Amino acid sequence: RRELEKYMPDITIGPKALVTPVSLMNARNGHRVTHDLLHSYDPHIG
Protein backbone atom coordinates (compact mmCIF):
# COMPACT_ATOMS: atom_id res chain seq x y z
CA ARG A 1 0.00 0.00 0.00
CA ARG A 2 2.85 2.38 0.84
CA GLU A 3 4.37 1.79 -2.60
CA LEU A 4 0.88 1.76 -4.13
CA GLU A 5 0.05 5.25 -2.85
CA LYS A 6 2.62 7.16 -4.95
CA TYR A 7 0.93 6.88 -8.36
CA MET A 8 -2.53 6.31 -6.82
CA PRO A 9 -3.52 9.22 -4.52
CA ASP A 10 -5.07 8.45 -1.16
CA ILE A 11 -8.56 9.68 -0.27
CA THR A 12 -9.42 8.08 3.08
CA ILE A 13 -12.23 9.96 4.81
CA GLY A 14 -12.66 7.03 7.19
CA PRO A 15 -15.61 4.91 8.31
CA LYS A 16 -17.75 8.01 8.94
CA ALA A 17 -18.33 8.44 5.20
CA LEU A 18 -19.93 4.96 5.02
CA VAL A 19 -22.65 5.56 7.65
CA THR A 20 -25.42 7.75 6.28
CA PRO A 21 -27.56 9.49 8.96
CA VAL A 22 -30.92 8.41 10.36
CA SER A 23 -32.74 10.98 8.20
CA LEU A 24 -31.60 9.11 5.05
CA MET A 25 -33.05 5.71 5.97
CA ASN A 26 -36.23 5.80 3.88
CA ALA A 27 -34.31 7.18 0.89
CA ARG A 28 -31.98 4.16 1.10
CA ASN A 29 -34.73 1.52 1.70
CA GLY A 30 -34.04 1.41 5.45
CA HIS A 31 -30.26 1.09 5.38
CA ARG A 32 -27.59 3.36 6.84
CA VAL A 33 -24.34 1.62 5.84
CA THR A 34 -22.74 1.27 2.40
CA HIS A 35 -20.93 -2.01 3.04
CA ASP A 36 -20.69 -4.69 0.36
CA LEU A 37 -22.66 -7.06 2.59
CA LEU A 38 -26.10 -6.11 3.86
CA HIS A 39 -26.72 -5.15 7.49
CA SER A 40 -29.84 -5.84 9.56
CA TYR A 41 -30.65 -3.73 12.62
CA ASP A 42 -32.35 -6.45 14.66
CA PRO A 43 -30.54 -8.30 17.48
CA HIS A 44 -31.81 -11.72 16.33
CA ILE A 45 -29.69 -11.62 13.16
CA GLY A 46 -26.88 -10.00 15.15
Residues that bind other proteins (CB under 8 A): 1, 3-14, 16-18, 20-21, 23-24, 26-29, 31, 34-38
CB of 44 to other proteins, least distance (A): 12
Angle (nearest 5°) at CA 39 between 15 and 14: 5
CA 42 to chain centre: 18
What end-to-end distance do the CA atoms of the chain give, in Å? 32
CB of 43 to other proteins, least distance (A): 17
Please say which residue, 3 or 42, places its beta carbon nearer to other proteins. Answer: 3
